[PDB]
Design a protein around this ligand. Structure first.
Ligand code: HEM
Length: 184
């Protein structure tokens, strides 16, 4: 189960974060052992569509090739802290698994600037016991983590040396699909 109440960035700028552009995961930290594969790739687009906060997600396992997309409408708990009911879609936005109660993730933006972010997410899905996940994001694919986000990791009392890099996986990203999905 998840164990952390992540604190959102003071003065979080929602319009900048939810601007329709893509964020690449560059490094991640799962608190539960073996909760996720050690080699993985992920990215998301966050934006507004007709006034609603939306995210589109992309997951890619660079070994098994397992690939999936999700779209969510986000509901506000407080500034920088959201609850998202996800639907699994193909890259075109065609629904493969409908939204269902109990299938949701929370999402807290702990730090963000115009090129980087630190987030926490707690995934709830079916009958699987899942733990907290932290992710360092960048606007640029595979960018090395800068001093601002690394300092934020420290300030959150986390050790960046424990984060797993995604940058050395042979991963490709369909940023056009992610952007398009925001409306789906
Ligand atoms: C590199 C970082 C990440 C890794 C390694 C990772 C890993 C995984 C894995 C292995 C699954 C499939 C679990 C299963 O169904 O058995 C999964 C599902 C999921 N993850 Fe992630 N994830 C990452 C980042 C994220 C982020 C940043 C978010 C939210 C913004 C997120 C949200 C979700 C959601 C909503 C599902 C279920 C989707 C569905 O079943 O339709 N993940 N993740």
């Amino acid at each position: 189960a998840c164990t952390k109440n992540a604190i959102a960035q003071t003065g979080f700028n929602k319009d900048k974060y939810f601007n329709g552009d893509v964020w690449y995961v560059t490094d991640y930290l799962d608190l539960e052992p073996d909760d996720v594969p050690k080699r993985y790739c992920a990215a998301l687009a966050a934006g507004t569509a007709s006034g609603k906060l939306k995210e589109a997600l992309y997951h890619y396992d660079p070994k098994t090739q397992d690939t999936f997309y999700d779209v969510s409408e986000l509901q506000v708990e407080s500034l920088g802290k959201y609850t998202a009911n996800f639907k699994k879609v193909d890259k075109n936005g065609n629904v493969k698994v409908a939204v269902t109660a109990g299938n949701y993730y929370t999402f807290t933006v702990m730090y963000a600037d115009d090129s980087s972010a630190l987030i926490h997410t707690c995934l709830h899905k079916g009958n699987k016991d899942r733990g907290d996940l932290y992710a360092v994001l960048n606007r640029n694919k595979d960018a090395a983590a800068g001093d601002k986000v690394k300092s934020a990791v420290s300030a959150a009392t986390l050790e960046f040396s424990k984060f797993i890099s995604t940058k050395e996986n042979n991963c490709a990203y369909d940023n056009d699909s992610l952007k398009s999905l925001l409306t789906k």
